[PDB]
Amino acid sequence: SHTDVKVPDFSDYRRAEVLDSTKSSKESSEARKGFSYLVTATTTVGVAY
Amino acid sequence: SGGGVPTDEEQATGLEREIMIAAQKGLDPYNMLPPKAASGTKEDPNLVPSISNKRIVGCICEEDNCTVIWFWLHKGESQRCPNCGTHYKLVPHQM
Amino acid sequence: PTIPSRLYSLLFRRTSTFALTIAVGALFFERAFDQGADAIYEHINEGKLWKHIKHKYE
Amino acid sequence: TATFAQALQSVPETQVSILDNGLRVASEQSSHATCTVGVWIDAGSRYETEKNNGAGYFLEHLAFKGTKNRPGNALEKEVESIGAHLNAYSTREHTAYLIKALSKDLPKVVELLADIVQNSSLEDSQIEKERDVILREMQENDASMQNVVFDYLHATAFQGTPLAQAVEGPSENVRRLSRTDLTDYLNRHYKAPRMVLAAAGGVEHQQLLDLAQKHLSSVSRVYEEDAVPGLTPCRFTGSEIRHRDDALPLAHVAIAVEGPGWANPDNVTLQVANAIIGHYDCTYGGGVHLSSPLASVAVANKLCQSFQTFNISYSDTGLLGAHFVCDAMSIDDMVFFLQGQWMRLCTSATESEVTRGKNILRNALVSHLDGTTPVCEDIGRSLLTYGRRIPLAEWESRIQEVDAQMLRDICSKYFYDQCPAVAGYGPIEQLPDYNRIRSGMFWLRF
Amino acid sequence: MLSRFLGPRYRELARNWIPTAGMWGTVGAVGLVWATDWRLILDWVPYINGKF
Amino acid sequence: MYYKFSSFTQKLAGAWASEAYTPQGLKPVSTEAPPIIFATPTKLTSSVTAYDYSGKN
Ligand SMILES: [Zn+2]
């Protein structure tokens, strides 16, 4: 059946604050994209220099 | 990252394990909370659990008092604090 | 109300504000990086550069 | 004359009372000679614990196959002997057994409902044959391809949580489930504080209260272990699942993000947003003049076969997004167009657009409650979810609060720069990767 | 011949796009004064006044 | 005949009798359940996301 399709566990690659399934998201998502966009912003500042 | 730090519902062993297990049932058999059901009446005494047939009973029998009246309580009929009148009955069924 | 949420919200969330952040950071990074690299270079070459011996010959 | 507010306040009020068992009995009365009486139970796939994953569905099958006092088809004969209609459904959170009947046979039907929720005779031969029937209709529902993408979207969005598993569950659980497991599920989740007895139509509320006191007294009321099954918040996962079968003629793609749930008011605003984008399929007779920009673009460019927006709510969570079926060569273009529409609602929503969405939501909310079956569904689901029946005048008051500024603020809060959950089924290699779909969820010009 | 955009909806679009276009203009001005090392504005700023 | 719960809005919509009240089809026998194989052996755990540790306990 199509209901036999189950997503495998991704917990080795998974980020730290999204590990437990019993905690809601949208509480630390802003921090995650703030980190990634800070990486992109620092890269853009360096190549602008 | 990771999990690793364990929740203390699994690493609790021994006296810590039974006090947490009993406390999250709400029962304290190891004298960690002040007990309830104050009644100095004759037909309804103060019930105090025990494991032996003899226990210390202290009576701060009027509020904001210096001295606690200490006396031994034995298995059987309930006798009062020897100056005020608060009854005390021992029940030796708490292991 | 936490600091990474508001840092994403008022600086990284909008793309124009992202570009303003990048431009101001570029200017301040230019000044601080120029000072730091110049100080490192003059410390490695202490007494060797012309500005270290410029005062002797007025 | 009578304007909209006066007719909205002229709708009769729903009366709710509480029994001693915690059973919530609610009804509302009209001039109709018929009635719809149902029992809504707070039991679904979210309460199942990965080894009884089809227990609610299998009880939902065996509930009509016989009870203790009415063994087998004689029960069935009884409801046909009064010409009534008996229906049921099971969601991830709610289970419902409802009966359309005439009002003049209000007592007997309540009696039937009583044993259906508390006296079901679970027989081994019935268990075997309904196991085969459930396997047959999972085979049937595999052909309903939008249901397949619905299940896939729930799985990939709610990975690791009890809200990923389907209501019917895996096939092995159907093959292996035993009567003791079903008895544990029904002893755990069919208690009286979680049941709402809802009635809509020409029924007296006091008469239904007397019937519920006579029949549905003392359903369970007892946990039997002092173990309350409590719901836990579920982690949303920005993810993509790609079931690829190129033999299919058409492809279904569903894209979603978080929605807040049942008890947060800006759902109403989100509903208006869906009313802006709307639905279309190939048999709509508007032409190139539809008000929805995505519909007119897809008609002009001949992209879609159908598209449809949704807002799905569970206890403090939900799925908000769109779902479309089209051929392969269109897929990528439509994703771009669809995301552009969302970004327009995030950035440059106007006032006539919001007014049109508000009128569409008014018509949807009023015309959905036409007849006693959807009114009874609204009563039972509202007492289970909101804790009360929200009147339609309260809905009209909340719709009137929506203007363009708060709508684009809410749409920027729930859509802009957010990781979606993407499910796909069919010839979907022109459906882009997760990076391009994620990058399409924000504008570089804001 | 630009009479197609005379209505309340385009005015609504305009007042929606005032702050984004103004912020993009601010980005352009700051980038121009940053890249050109223009002495009018860079003397009005505290920390960058170190090389002058 | 009258109402079936569907339509992605979680609503009791209207549907034909052949699908509202006969949801199981007239196909006689279920044919098979084809199993899922993976590339690597994956730890596809439904409950509590497999395990959480960082060493030997
Ligand atoms: Zn005393």
Side-chain angles (χ1 to χ4, degrees), chain A, chain B, chain C, chain D, chain E, chain F residues 1-43 50 55-57:
Chain A
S1 161
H2 74 277
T3 61
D4 299 359
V5 174
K6 186 166 290 294
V7 185
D9 176 74
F10 277 95
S11 56
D12 306 280
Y13 312 97
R14 213 174 254 272
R15 218 182 278 249
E17 54 264 21
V18 293
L19 270 180
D20 43 353
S21 66
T22 61
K23 283 308 173 302
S24 167
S25 197
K26 306 167 90 80
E27 301 186 310
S28 52
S29 55
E30 303 208 30
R32 306 188 254 119
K33 50 200 57 180
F35 166 67
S36 299
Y37 294 155
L38 170 76
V39 168
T40 315
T42 45
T43 309
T44 313
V45 163
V47 302
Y49 168 80
Chain B
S1 287
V5 176
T7 301
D8 62 358
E9 61 96 10
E10 191 196 310
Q11 203 143 320
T13 57
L15 184 80
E16 204 165 5
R17 173 65 160 223
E18 292 84 4
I19 65 182
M20 293 177 70
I21 280 285
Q24 71 187 1
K25 304 322 152 293
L27 183 63
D28 178 62
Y30 293 99
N31 213 325
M32 296 266 303
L33 294 174
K36 300 289 94 175
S39 74
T41 49
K42 314 332 201 313
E43 68 270 16
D44 193 297
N46 293 331
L47 271 293
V48 54
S50 169
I51 190 167
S52 174
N53 44 4
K54 206 169 56 75
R55 205 188 159 154
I56 302 297
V57 167
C59 197
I60 318 179
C61 48
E62 63 92 26
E63 299 325 286
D64 306 0
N65 199 8
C66 181
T67 61
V68 192
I69 302 301
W70 307 105
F71 65 101
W72 280 112
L73 182 63
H74 318 282
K75 187 202 291 182
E77 261 186 290
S78 62
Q79 73 303 350
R80 293 177 287 117
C81 174
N83 81 315
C84 78
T86 61
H87 266 278
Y88 286 108
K89 177 153 76 211
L90 197 78
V91 286
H93 67 269
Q94 188 262 306
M95 300 325 88
Chain C
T2 76
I3 203 72
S5 160
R6 61 180 275 106
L7 265 291
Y8 159 71
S9 85
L10 61 84
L11 275 154
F12 289 135
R13 184 176 179 179
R14 223 181 315 260
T15 308
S16 58
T17 300
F18 194 59
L20 182 66
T21 315
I22 286 159
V24 175
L27 188 48
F28 280 124
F29 178 102
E30 279 169 359
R31 271 278 292 151
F33 199 82
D34 268 351
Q35 269 170 20
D38 271 300
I40 288 160
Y41 189 78
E42 62 166 80
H43 172 77
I44 293 173
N45 298 288
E46 198 168 67
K48 268 198 291 193
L49 284 149
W50 167 246
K51 36 179 286 297
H52 295 90
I53 61 157
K54 187 170 35 67
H55 49 77
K56 306 211 282 225
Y57 313 102
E58 66 183 1
Chain D
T1 184
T3 182
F4 201 62
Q6 294 151 347
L8 265 288
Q9 82 175 349
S10 278
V11 188
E13 183 178 1
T14 285
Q15 321 197 27
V16 188
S17 48
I18 316 297
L19 264 68
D20 277 349
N21 305 122
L23 167 82
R24 282 201 286 223
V25 171
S27 73
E28 86 171 11
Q29 198 171 357
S30 87
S31 65
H32 298 170
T34 70
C35 75
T36 296
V37 192
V39 174
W40 271 259
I41 317 169
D42 219 350
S45 169
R46 206 178 170 170
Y47 299 95
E48 289 146 16
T49 61
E50 62 86 20
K51 47 176 71 169
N52 50 343
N53 220 332
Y57 201 67
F58 183 75
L59 294 175
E60 190 276 331
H61 275 69
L62 288 173
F64 304 149
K65 302 311 284 182
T67 53
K68 261 81 165 186
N69 290 318
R70 294 163 175 85
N73 55 344
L75 188 153
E76 183 178 1
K77 281 200 300 275
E78 175 49 60
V79 74
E80 266 186 320
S81 294
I82 75 175
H85 283 272
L86 162 69
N87 203 12
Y89 61 89
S90 184
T91 68
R92 269 160 187 87
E93 265 196 342
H94 308 291
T95 303
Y97 311 108
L98 73 164
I99 297 187
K100 310 176 54 183
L102 298 195
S103 49
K104 62 213 70 163
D105 204 356
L106 186 56
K108 184 78 172 178
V109 64
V110 170
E111 181 157 25
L112 294 166
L113 274 180
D115 69 11
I116 284 164
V117 286
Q118 76 204 350
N119 291 308
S120 187
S121 173
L122 299 174
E123 306 299 315
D124 48 346
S125 55
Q126 275 286 347
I127 277 158
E128 289 161 334
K129 63 177 55 54
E130 282 304 305
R131 157 178 305 130
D132 284 88
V133 175
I134 290 176
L135 279 164
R136 274 169 55 197
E137 66 182 1
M138 310 185 318
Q139 185 194 0
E140 190 83 14
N141 292 326
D142 287 355
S144 180
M145 187 182 307
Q146 73 154 10
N147 296 152
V148 177
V149 185
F150 196 72
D151 278 327
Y152 284 173
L153 180 84
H154 273 86
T156 198
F158 292 122
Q159 305 173 0
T161 69
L163 183 62
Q165 45 204 16
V167 194
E168 68 275 16
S171 296
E172 293 94 1
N173 267 321
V174 178
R175 276 140 52 168
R176 81 149 172 257
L177 209 45
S178 73
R179 197 202 189 273
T180 57
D181 291 331
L182 278 297
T183 316
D184 307 328
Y185 187 83
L186 188 153
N187 291 2
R188 277 205 71 86
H189 298 111
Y190 272 27
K191 302 175 189 313
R194 320 152 78 102
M195 290 164 180
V196 186
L197 182 63
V203 286
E204 193 78 27
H205 176 68
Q206 197 53 246
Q207 169 177 354
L208 192 88
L209 203 44
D210 298 349
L211 291 170
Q213 194 49 271
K214 178 156 59 210
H215 294 300
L216 286 152
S217 180
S218 85
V219 176
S220 276
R221 178 63 269 175
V222 184
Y223 300 97
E224 309 156 357
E225 293 179 353
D226 276 321
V228 189
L231 276 192
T232 300
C234 295
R235 160 198 62 199
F236 189 78
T237 287
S239 67
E240 181 204 57
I241 180 166
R242 303 179 83 97
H243 193 176
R244 183 175 176 86
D245 193 3
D246 270 314
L248 314 178
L250 291 173
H252 293 236
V253 182
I255 315 184
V257 291
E258 290 275 79
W262 285 116
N264 189 358
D266 46 2
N267 289 318
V268 182
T269 308
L270 288 179
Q271 287 279 314
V272 183
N274 297 326
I276 282 166
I277 303 174
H279 43 84
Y280 172 86
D281 59 328
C282 61
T283 81
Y284 277 177
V288 285
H289 305 141
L290 282 72
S291 287
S292 169
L294 198 156
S296 49
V297 159
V299 160
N301 302 328
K302 293 294 170 109
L303 295 171
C304 64
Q305 266 304 313
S306 87
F307 64 91
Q308 167 192 190
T309 47
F310 52 86
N311 200 3
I312 295 163
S313 295
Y314 316 97
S315 314
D316 55 68
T317 191
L319 286 170
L320 168 67
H323 155 83
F324 48 90
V325 58
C326 55
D327 55 332
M329 295 298 103
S330 312
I331 290 176
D332 162 77
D333 270 321
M334 185 179 289
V335 174
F336 151 78
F337 279 125
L338 166 68
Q339 275 174 331
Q341 285 307 298
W342 282 340
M343 291 325 98
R344 210 179 41 84
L345 289 189
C346 294
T347 43
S348 46
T350 65
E351 280 284 334
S352 80
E353 183 178 1
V354 164
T355 302
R356 186 184 91 245
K358 273 151 68 176
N359 295 347
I360 289 173
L361 191 59
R362 281 173 195 110
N363 275 306
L365 278 189
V366 177
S367 60
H368 172 233
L369 312 172
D370 263 353
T372 58
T373 295
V375 166
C376 186
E377 180 213 10
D378 195 64
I379 289 159
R381 183 191 35 71
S382 306
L383 276 296
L384 273 175
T385 49
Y386 310 112
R388 59 174 190 97
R389 171 94 195 275
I390 293 173
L392 269 173
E394 171 86 340
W395 288 118
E396 173 42 16
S397 177
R398 284 175 167 195
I399 283 168
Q400 282 161 350
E401 296 174 10
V402 175
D403 64 298
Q405 181 66 62
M406 64 101 78
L407 188 145
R408 60 180 165 266
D409 272 355
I410 285 304
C411 277
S412 59
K413 190 195 180 54
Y414 280 99
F415 279 110
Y416 196 80
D417 211 356
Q418 301 286 333
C419 313
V422 178
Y425 192 20
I428 50 154
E429 69 174 356
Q430 211 181 288
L431 165 80
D433 52 350
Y434 196 81
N435 266 8
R436 288 280 279 274
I437 296 165
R438 170 65 185 82
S439 310
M441 292 276 288
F442 71 98
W443 272 349
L444 292 170
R445 60 187 177 267
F446 178 58
Chain E
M1 285 303 155
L2 279 74
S3 66
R4 208 176 283 157
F5 316 118
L6 277 296
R9 204 183 66 86
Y10 302 104
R11 184 177 178 179
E12 262 186 51
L13 275 170
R15 54 201 321 280
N16 265 330
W17 281 95
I18 306 313
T20 300
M23 185 179 288
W24 273 115
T26 285
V27 170
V30 165
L32 184 135
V33 74
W34 154 85
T36 50
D37 291 331
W38 200 6
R39 294 81 71 201
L40 275 189
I41 299 104
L42 279 188
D43 291 331
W44 275 329
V45 64
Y47 182 56
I48 320 293
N49 273 328
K51 65 179 72 66
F52 314 105
Chain F
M1 293 180 183
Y2 291 93
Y3 287 91
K4 182 163 94 137
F5 187 87
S6 194
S7 180
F8 275 52
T9 61
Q10 309 153 309
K11 293 182 183 293
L12 264 171
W16 298 345
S18 296
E19 61 166 19
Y21 276 31
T22 286
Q24 62 84 30
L26 279 74
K27 298 190 81 81
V29 176
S30 305
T31 176
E32 72 267 12
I36 299 103
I37 62 170
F38 294 90
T40 73
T42 60
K43 63 182 181 293
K56 181 69 176 177
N57 177 272

